[PDB]
Protein: Protein argonaute-2
Organism: Homo sapiens
Amino acid sequence: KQFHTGIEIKVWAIACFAPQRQCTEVHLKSFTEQLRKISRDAGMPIQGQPCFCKYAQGADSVEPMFRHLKNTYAGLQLVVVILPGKTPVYAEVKRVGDTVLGMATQCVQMKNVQRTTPQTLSNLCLKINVKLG
């Protein structure tokens, strides 16, 4: 689809369902910085500092976390969710985000947070653009 202008993502969260020992804090910070720069250059700036960034484990942690996020951060525009491979977490994120709380979520694979490429970051921005468009 066509790119939408005028999006600024100022309030957003990271929920990392990948294990910290696999997807460390510096991996998260590096990924976030790369995402900040390309979204900016593309004209849909995602601000560099998320309002929240935490690790969690298992699909059962999703609903309590997203409820917490909704109850805590006014103006929340997006939750970026990092998945460790193929996992029931994805289905739960979408159930809770799309059909329970009306919260925009974008999932990303752990391997693409550990090592980014402009192309994978581009895929992400485009998915995000469509969602908040």
Remarks:
- Strands lie at 12-16, 52-55, 78-83, 105-109.
